[model samples]
Target: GFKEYPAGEPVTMNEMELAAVYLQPIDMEPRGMGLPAAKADVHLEADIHAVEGNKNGFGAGEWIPYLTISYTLVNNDTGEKQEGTFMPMVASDGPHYGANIKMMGVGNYKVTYHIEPPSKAGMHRHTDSETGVGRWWKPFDVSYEFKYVGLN
Candidate 1:
């Protein structure tokens, strides 16, 4: 939806240094799935652990999958910001997750995630800046700084 954070109240999109940025499959090209497999396009991925405060449904205590999560990646070199939403990809046995998404190329990206709860989708959370929702919480949370590296 919205790409950049256009906050006029001297707002800023802070980086959350909460996770590691690495390439973990899901390439843009079909590297091994198709015939004459294309030279693997660099695929980007992320893995993170929740802060001691909130799991948003990523722990033993558990939470409903009824939350909306979105993320952004800014190419530090170009000052280009790419934003998108994250889908849940569960691993076997237990339930840890990778950001499980991809990016364009190689560089350092300022990664951030915004979460909103007590509703169906995070529409209000995504836009609301100053005053919070009724059962509201802070928006523009859980920042991370990641260095993007690709295959040789």
Candidate 2:
């Protein structure tokens, strides 16, 4: 799941301080337990904006179109995974693809996103930051572990 915040100026310290008072109590609650165990259900979604390129640095109104974006989900504990290919039928913005998974009784399960890009394997120009030589397609993996409370 994701949330977006519109572009805006930074909040004032007084506003932040006030917000913190309400948020701190919630943070004090313990996590990872207290819920009944159940099968793990996992899902993922992604948005792929067209790539834009820039020749100059620092807020130059240009972005290079070098790569394509897609995503995947993996169950680390079982090594089970699902990948999403670029589907023209899917809209370019928001939750383009997803995966649903069911796990055996759960304690802590690791779910991950395996992002694969077009430039990954010597198919495109390779920069120092690029993982492969001239190959831009790469995997951006992120993992989160959570306990599953029994179905509500």
Candidate 3:
């Protein structure tokens, strides 16, 4: 499930674009719906897309799949922290990595996502001359700051 809101500006690196955004928590099918919306404040997501060319066999502008994504949220106001691994799921917008976060009260929060490339996530690539590609980018972190005033 998904609902859209103005998301943070996307950061592009290693031929990929990563954006951080949150939506009103909603239920999912088959998996992860266990975290009922009634118990969560927001569904944090990392919208990662390819810049151009079929980097992961998926066409350009498609979601970068098979990523080992995890998040750490620190409450700037209270110094509280929450961390969790994100699951790959698809929504109305498209595919993404996200999870339901039981937000740390209200106030300011900074979210950081550590993204491991497909190679590290157990997806191998072609290396022959005709289909060979360069090495994968090293794992990296991307962070974004946002205020959580409690969703309606």
Which prediction has the highest TM-score against the true structure?
A: 3
TM-score between candidate 3 and the true structure: 0.87
> Model 2, 1-152: lDDT tens per residue?
12221111222221110000000011112233212123223322232333224111212222223223344434446666554432221222322333223434434344443445444522354456534233332455444454533233
lDDT of each: 0.42, 0.31, 0.80
lDDT of 2 at 64: 20
C-alpha TM-score for every candidate? 0.49, 0.32, 0.87
Query: Which has the better lDDT: candidate 1, or candidate 2?
Result: 1
| lDDT at 105, model 2 | 48
Off by over 4 Å in 3: 53-59
Candidate 2 error regions (>4 Å): 1-93, 119-137
Residue 54, candidate 3: Cα error in Å is 7.5
Say which candidate scores most in lDDT: 3
Pairs that collide, model 2: 52-63, 52-64, 53-63, 53-64, 119-136, 119-137, 120-136, 120-137, 122-134, 122-135
**Candidate 1: which pairs clash?**
16-143, 16-144, 17-144
Worst 10 residues of 2 by lDDT: 17-26
